[PDB]
Amino acid sequence: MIHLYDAKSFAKLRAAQYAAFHTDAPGSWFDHTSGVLESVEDGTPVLAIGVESGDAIVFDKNAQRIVAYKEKSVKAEDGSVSVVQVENGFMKQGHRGWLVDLTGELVGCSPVVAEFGGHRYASGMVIVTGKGNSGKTPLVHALGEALGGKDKYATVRFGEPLSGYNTDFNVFVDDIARAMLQHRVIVIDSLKNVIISRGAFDLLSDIGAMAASRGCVVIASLNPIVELVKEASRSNSTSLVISTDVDGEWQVLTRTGEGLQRLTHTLQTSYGEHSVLTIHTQTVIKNDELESVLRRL
Amino acid sequence: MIHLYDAKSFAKLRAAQYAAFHTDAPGSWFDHTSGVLESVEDGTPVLAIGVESGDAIVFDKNAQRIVAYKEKSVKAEDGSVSVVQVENGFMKQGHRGWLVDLTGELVGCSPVVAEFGGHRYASGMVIVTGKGNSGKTPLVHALGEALGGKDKYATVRFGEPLSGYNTDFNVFVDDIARAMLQHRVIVIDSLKNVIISRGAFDLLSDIGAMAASRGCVVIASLNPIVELVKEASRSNSTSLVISTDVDGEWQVLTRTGEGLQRLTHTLQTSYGEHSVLTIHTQTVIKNDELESVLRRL
Amino acid sequence: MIHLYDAKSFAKLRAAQYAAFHTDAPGSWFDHTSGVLESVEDGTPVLAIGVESGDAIVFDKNAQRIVAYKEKSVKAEDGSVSVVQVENGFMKQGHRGWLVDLTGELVGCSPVVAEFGGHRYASGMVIVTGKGNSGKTPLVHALGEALGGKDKYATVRFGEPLSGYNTDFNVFVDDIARAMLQHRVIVIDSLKNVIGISRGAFDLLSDIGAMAASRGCVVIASLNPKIVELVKEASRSNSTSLVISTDVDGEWQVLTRTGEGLQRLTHTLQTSYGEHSVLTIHTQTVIKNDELESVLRRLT
Amino acid sequence: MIHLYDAKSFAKLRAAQYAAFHTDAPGSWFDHTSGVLESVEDGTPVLAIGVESGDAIVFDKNAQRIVAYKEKSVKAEDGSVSVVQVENGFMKQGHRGWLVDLTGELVGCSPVVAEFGGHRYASGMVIVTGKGNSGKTPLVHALGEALGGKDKYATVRFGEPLSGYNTDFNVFVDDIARAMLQHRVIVIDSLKNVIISRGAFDLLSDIGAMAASRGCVVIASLNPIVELVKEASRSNSTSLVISTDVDGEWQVLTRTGEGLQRLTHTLQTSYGEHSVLTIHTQTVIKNDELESVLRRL
Amino acid sequence: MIHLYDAKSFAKLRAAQYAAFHTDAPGSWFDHTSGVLESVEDGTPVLAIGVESGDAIVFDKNAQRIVAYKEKSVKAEDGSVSVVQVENGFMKQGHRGWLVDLTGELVGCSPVVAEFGGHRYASGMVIVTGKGNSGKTPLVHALGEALGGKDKYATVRFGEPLSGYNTDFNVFVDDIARAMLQHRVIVIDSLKNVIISRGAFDLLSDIGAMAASRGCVVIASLNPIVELVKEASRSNSTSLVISTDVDGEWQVLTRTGEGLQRLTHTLQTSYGEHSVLTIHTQTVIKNDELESVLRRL
Amino acid sequence: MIHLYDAKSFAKLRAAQYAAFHTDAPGSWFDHTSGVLESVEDGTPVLAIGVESGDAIVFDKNAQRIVAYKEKSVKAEDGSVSVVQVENGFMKQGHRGWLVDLTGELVGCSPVVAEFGGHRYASGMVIVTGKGNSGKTPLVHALGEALGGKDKYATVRFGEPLSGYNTDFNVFVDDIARAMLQHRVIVIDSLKNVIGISRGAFDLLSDIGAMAASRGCVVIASLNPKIVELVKEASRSNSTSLVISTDVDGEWQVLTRTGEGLQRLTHTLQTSYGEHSVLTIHTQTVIKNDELESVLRRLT
Ligand SMILES: O=c1ccn([C@@H]2O[C@H](COP(=O)(O)OP(=O)(O)OP(=O)(O)O)[C@@H](O)[C@H]2O)c(=O)[nH]1
Ligand SMILES: O=c1ccn([C@@H]2O[C@H](COP(=O)(O)OP(=O)(O)OP(=O)(O)O)[C@@H](O)[C@H]2O)c(=O)[nH]1
Ligand SMILES: O=c1ccn([C@@H]2O[C@H](COP(=O)(O)OP(=O)(O)OP(=O)(O)O)[C@@H](O)[C@H]2O)c(=O)[nH]1
Ligand SMILES: O=c1ccn([C@@H]2O[C@H](COP(=O)(O)OP(=O)(O)OP(=O)(O)O)[C@@H](O)[C@H]2O)c(=O)[nH]1
Ligand SMILES: O=c1ccn([C@@H]2O[C@H](COP(=O)(O)OP(=O)(O)OP(=O)(O)O)[C@@H](O)[C@H]2O)c(=O)[nH]1
Ligand SMILES: O=c1ccn([C@@H]2O[C@H](COP(=O)(O)OP(=O)(O)OP(=O)(O)O)[C@@H](O)[C@H]2O)c(=O)[nH]1
Secondary structure, three states: OOEEEOHHHHHHHHHHHHHHHHOOOOOHHHHHHHHHHHOOOOOOOOEEEEOOOOOEEEEOOOOOEOOOEEEEEEEOOOOOEEEEEEEOOEEEEOOOEEOOOOOOOOOOEOOEEEEEOOEEEEOEEEEEEOOOOOOHHHHHHHHHHHHHOOOOEEEEEEOOOOOOOEOOHHHHHHHHHHHHHHOOEEEEEOOOOOOOOHHHHHHHHHHHHHHHHHOOEEEEEOOOOHHHHHHHHHHOOOEEEEEOOOOOEEEEEEEOEOOOOEEEEEEEEEEOHHHOEEEOOOEEOOHHHHHHHHHOO | OOEEEOHHHHHHHHHHHHHHHHOOOOOHHHHHHHHHHHHOOOOOOOEEEEOOOOOEEEEOOOOOEOOOEEEEEEEOOOOOEEEEEEEOOEEEEOOOEEOOOOOOOOOOEOOEEEEEOOEEEEOEEEEEEOOOOOOHHHHHHHHHHHHHOOOOEEEEEEOOOOOOOEOOHHHHHHHHHHHHHHOOEEEEEOOOOOOOOHHHHHHHHHHHHHHHHHOOEEEEEOOOOHHHHHHHHHHOOOEEEEEOOOOOEEEEEEEOEOOOOEEEEEEEEEEOHHHOEEEOOOEEOOHHHHHHHHHOO | OOEEEOHHHHHHHHHHHHHHHHOOOOOHHHHHHHHHHHHOOOOOOOEEEEOOOOOEEEEOOOOOEOOOEEEEEEEOOOOOEEEEEEEOOEEEEOOOEEOOOOOOOOOOEOOEEEEEOOEEEEOEEEEEEOOOOOOHHHHHHHHHHHHHOOOOEEEEEEOOOOOOOEOOHHHHHHHHHHHHHHOOEEEEEOOHHHHOOOHHHHHHHHHHHHHHHHHOOEEEEEOOOOHHHHHHHHHHHOOOEEEEEOOOOOEEEEEEEOEOOOOEEEEEEEEEEOHHHOEEEOOOEEOOHHHHHHHHHOOO | OOEEEOHHHHHHHHHHHHHHHHOOOOOHHHHHHHHHHHOOOOOOOOEEEEOOOOOEEEEOOOOOEOOOEEEEEEEOOOOOEEEEEEEOOEEEEOOOEEOOOOOOOOOOEOOEEEEEOOEEEEOEEEEEEOOOOOOHHHHHHHHHHHHHOOOOEEEEEEOOOOOOOEOOHHHHHHHHHHHHHHOOEEEEEOOOOOOOOHHHHHHHHHHHHHHHHHOOEEEEEOOOOHHHHHHHHHHOOOEEEEEOOOOOEEEEEEEOEOOOOEEEEEEEEEEOHHHOEEEOOOEEOOHHHHHHHHHOO | OOEEEOHHHHHHHHHHHHHHHHOOOOOHHHHHHHHHHHHOOOOOOOEEEEOOOOOEEEEOOOOOEOOOEEEEEEEOOOOOEEEEEEEOOEEEEOOOEEOOOOOOOOOOEOOEEEEEOOEEEEOEEEEEEOOOOOOHHHHHHHHHHHHHOOOOEEEEEEOOOOOOOEOOHHHHHHHHHHHHHHOOEEEEEOOOOOOOOHHHHHHHHHHHHHHHHHOOEEEEEOOOOHHHHHHHHHHOOOEEEEEOOOOOEEEEEEEOEOOOOEEEEEEEEEEOHHHOEEEOOOEEOOHHHHHHHHHOO | OOEEEOHHHHHHHHHHHHHHHHOOOOOHHHHHHHHHHHHOOOOOOOEEEEOOOOOEEEEOOOOOEOOOEEEEEEEOOOOOEEEEEEEOOEEEEOOOEEOOOOOOOOOOEOOEEEEEOOEEEEOEEEEEEOOOOOOHHHHHHHHHHHHHOOOOEEEEEEOOOOOOOEOOHHHHHHHHHHHHHHOOEEEEEOOHHHHOOOHHHHHHHHHHHHHHHHHOOEEEEEOOOOHHHHHHHHHHHOOOEEEEEOOOOOEEEEEEEOEOOOOEEEEEEEEEEOHHHOEEEOOOEEOOHHHHHHHHHOOO
């Protein structure tokens, strides 16, 4: 919805956004939105996501697809009306994204998803990319385990020429929807085949906001069309993890919230048995330095 | 409609257009059009805006969407007939833009929306853009608060990978329509995802004229496809706010009206707590200097 | 229709075309076609113009849109049949352009629309363009007033981010149709969004010059310069005349196609601003194709 | 249809093709095909031509459009079956081009259309083009009158911003069809707007063969997308008339028949009153010289 | 169908493929497939070819088009089922190409079509192309007569601005189908207008295999979009005849079979009366030399 | 489906993936999936593959096409529901790929298909490509025979101008589906016309590697190099292994993805021709991403 501000309410918002990353208990936002989803009446649509054609499929709180849902309208606080209708397995009225309010007035956050190695990590979409010899697949799994912490991480597999990999985009969005509905830490391997269908364009534009609203992190590998990789990394990701000149070393660049500073830190990594990667255990980065990082792609 | 002029009536028009920016009380036009909208008979369509497909949705004076409206014709002063019909939630007959006359003979104005720091600002669309380290999001919010003055400004959020951000274009145009119907100062963060669908093309072509007719200002962030950013900044904006070589410094370029001089002034800014930006408190700019400014993108 | 010529009838045509620009009373063609339109029986379609989709809408002599019109055929002199039918507000049979004969055998003219400052100006479409600091909007209004003379000029506004500007293409073509049906001197500000492409926009660029020249009205259209080459081609091939800014501030070059197969003429305009940016225009030489291309190169 | 040859029948064909340009009385082929068309039973389709959409409209021998025609099949000499059906003003079955046989075994000719100034000119399509100051419109009319000889030439006007010019492609193809059905010498001013719709592509590919089969000449002005002008001039024209370095001077390049030599000669011209051009009163040209000529465009 | 091999059966296949070009009596394959076609039961579809739209038309053994054919299934040796159905003059079920088995296990051949001047020539598609002054049209007719030998060659004419030339693609594919059904040596003048519709793409991809399966040769002129000419010449042709630096001289490059060596030889030619060309009466060429030849286009 | 991991279960997966290439008996995965397919109830859809239009056709375990199949749902372990429905010969509900579970928890493998000349070879798709004089067609047949071992290899022929070659894409996908359903070693000659693009062709390039790796069969496809970059990306991202010609005639480099997140391995092949162009292949080192890109650069 739209929000109105004066100087005082705006300052309060920025303080709350800052807290949502810097001082909230890691993973608190995820637990909060889990409660909101759990409170939703049975059969109510909670999430719509685009399929390959640009139509949208709709899910309930238990990640079960809704095939039929009678037109139903809800008036928001700002006066806007949201309508939802599902017919023959597809959204007839509504919008892509969360169909229930997970955020309220607290918008524009990068809710802290986890803390690891003395660094806080944001929810939203994290694109893992770069050139050179440092492998992306081992990194995304290492990050998934690390941010998972006490919890297991969920793996969505797509579009690689290996056993058991789904290559159908419509199954992919079903997997992603279920993952975000049920898990705080999600790995996607890989985004190569989405990088173009209306569904693929929708996914790139929608997923970061979907994840940040939920308070889950989606860690997606993307091997570098090159300008679309750059723009997805620049504008569609909440955080970026990019390989450097030095083997095993990665740079993490985090958007900490709406209008807030982008932060950076470095990761050192090494391989153990069967290529299992281990990540070893604040500085601001400006826009010109950010573009300098993107040039390496 | 079409308008006829001789030398004397043309000179009168230019004098009135000049006054609409330079000497009218700031925000007076907005208050005038609010009165016009308030005088509209119950149920009457007042605004049509394009959705993603290129179809148009229609709103009444209270920013409520009209789903059904029997064909109704109105003869204008020049002899032209405007017809409006709405069926199944979509415009069947009519045009995009204001469906009631807010302007009359007084067309081609950039009605003054506010005065701040000794400078007058125009209604219409203001694109906030540029390269370098000066942040666009903090600027648009600072400008929104400043031009809001005694009034709160409205924030429309779109297409960023942060919590609570809508990423569905059809919700976006609903938000924008409501904002322009109800508020003098509007911030859009951001225009990145519109920059292509018929709806997106319609919005870029329509919004400046819609806002200027209302006397509201739409302050839109746009991070630089590059030629589309240049043309939107060159030809679709009433004013442009562009970052400079010096950190914190911005140049404001204002179209003051039809056939009138483009003016320029500079803004100095600084950050306080939680990245809240403060803007610190006539010279003509020619077309070649304007192009020189656009080259920096 | 098609026309047949031998040496003698061709020479006569060229003499008549030459006269239509050089010696006819300025604005005489417009008055003639006004009479033709006024003589048309009530309810008869006179003009069809393309909307955004590429369908065509149809107008009667009073610039009122025709919604329903039973199929009706007319056999021309060359043996061809023109059919007109309108159903549900759209042309079902017919063609874009004038649906009644305004011209007869006298085709390929640039009928003189006005004389100002010792120069004759052609009807048809005039594109006002160029680079540099000389403003196009003040020029089109100055030219509109000047060629209007004793008469007011009509202003069609389209696609600028200013108060009261229509930005819907289908309203735009309605405005243009009405303007050409009712006025000799017409200003369009601006053509930017038509060049910004729909079938309707393509139709308009291809149709408007011939429509205006047939009527004997002048359409003075501002156009600020893939896209640049379309501005060049519209200026090169879709305009009856071109007014282009020069190196010197306030100075413009007017390039006029005087008729079918006839010489393109050129002259210069000097201008200055008064109060509230009102521009005043201050008061024969042939230009060849290579010089014409040299002028178009400046649009880069 | 398909034709079978051995050495002896092939040599006979080449001799007949050579004669069709070099020794037949100028305009004889046109008179022959006029007789063939005149012999066609009343109401029979004789010519189909593409409209803008790529559908085809159909004409009888009197250049009257056929709106309804019951399916009718004709078996050719080679065993092939040609079917023709027209429904609701459009071809339902058939092909673009001549729907009756004007040529028989005598195919691949450039039938002589006229002789002027000691040079024979071919029927088919003649593209008049080039750069520089020599005007194309005066040339096409001068050539039309000259090749017309004792007969008037027909003028088809299209796509110029001058009084009485048709700009609707579907009227254009109607004009062209009627012209070719009724006249030996035809001028088109101009081909600029065809140079893209399916109809325009069809016309460029069809018109030369249509005209050569009839024995009429279509003299078309084409101002130079540039590569499409080159290919139309190279491959879609029976003859080319191109301006040179010297003002008033033109080069005529003629395909004299299937597998036969391309010939060249020069024209000198001058203007009289009201820009009426007068043309003042064998050498082979090879493919490399032909390409050299096309480079000048 | 699919075929299974071990070392011994593979070696046998390669020996048979080698023989099909090098040692079989010239034209023997054509006579064999004529027998196969003649043995087909009355009314049975034997050949399907794509029309402009990408639909397919269907022919019987007598080159008569089939308009209606009830669904009929045939189980192949590998277990696959081929179904054929024709409705309203178009293929409803089936595939493009030969609808009866002309080859059996003997696949991947370039069956010898003729011997002339001490050189064997392959069936399939021969593209005649190149730059320079050597004419393609006279060459294709000279080659047609020469390879025809005791038999007349068939000429398919398409897309040139000369008398009697068909320019409608759907008539073109009808001509080609009939030619391949009834004649061993076929000339196409020319392929310029096919070089894009689905039908044109189908034809370029299908014709070589169609011709090689039949044992007929299709000799097609193609004047050089340039990369499409290169790829058609590189990958869609069984043999290539390309002009050289020396006037009248041509290089013939022949694919002799699946996985077999490409051979080359040179032709010398001269003109007699009315431009009738006479061709005057083993060395391997590698891929790098082949690309060197293609660069000349 | 989605899979959940902690450190311990992830380490177990990587160990199992490593084993699936390095230590499992060659061809064991193929035999396992043959058993799974054989156990499927009569009439059950097992494989869906895209036709030219982007619709999908569906096959049973005997490689017979299914024309009609009533909607049928199956709930997976992760909670997801897979639905399959076939109407009028086309998939109405379902997904492209294997419609029965051949893999279970054991995903992301490159199951060893064969061992030859002291080297293990992966199932999945192998693209055979490169520039220079070394012929691709003889190589794919030599590799087919070699990896076939005791078994014959299947040859799918497509899009070459030679006798008996199918050139219809929909027949091609039928051939490929049958081949993967019935044979461990498959040769495709050639992929040129799929790269020559339809939705079906795009689907095939994106689907075939995963289909083959899931089955444990190897698809050995020749591909001769806008278009060049698509050959590079297909070779880079759509292939389980790559066999590319080198500077030296007869010599090839084999680059193998050994599994999800595992090392890419490389070795060289020497070859020579016998009679009638029959090629014979004569009888671990890791390759990094920068070296891999260096190899791909040679395709220009
Ligand atoms: O022990 C190992 C294993 C793997 N790797 C390296 O990590 C990579 C992980 O395996 P991938 O094949 O997934 O590579 P990637 O994610 O970097 O890029 P794509 O191929 O998916 O586009 C492998 O390509 C390998 O080079 C190591 O450096 N050490
Ligand atoms: O205290 C602060 C906070 C923020 N900033 C700067 O302001 C920017 C505002 O945050 P954004 O991430 O919105 O940057 P932006 O609007 O310029 O561009 P997008 O990424 O949205 O396209 C941040 O990127 C940061 O560099 C400061 O300079 N100081
Ligand atoms: O007094 C004046 C007023 C205006 N001008 C100049 O005339 C121009 C007329 O006003 P516009 O803003 O319309 O500029 P334009 O027509 O040249 O081009 P667009 O922006 O419409 O594409 C303005 O851009 C201004 O620079 C003057 O030179 N002096
Ligand atoms: O007496 C004359 C008349 C005309 N001309 C020249 O002949 C041309 C014929 O008039 P056009 O305007 O038709 O020029 P064109 O055919 O060469 O090219 P387009 O403008 O149609 O694209 C004119 O443009 C003029 O330059 C002369 O050289 N002498
Ligand atoms: O006696 C002759 C006749 C013809 N020729 C040459 O042979 C060519 C055959 O006539 P074409 O015009 O068909 O040339 P082409 O096939 O090479 O190319 P297209 O224009 O058809 O695309 C002619 O262009 C001519 O140059 C001779 O060298 N000597
Ligand atoms: O004995 C032989 C036979 C064949 N070859 C070489 O092997 C190649 C195999 O025959 P192909 O003609 O199939 O070549 P290719 O597979 O390399 O590429 P495409 O043409 O299919 O795109 C032939 O091109 C030939 O040069 C030899 O080097 N020696």
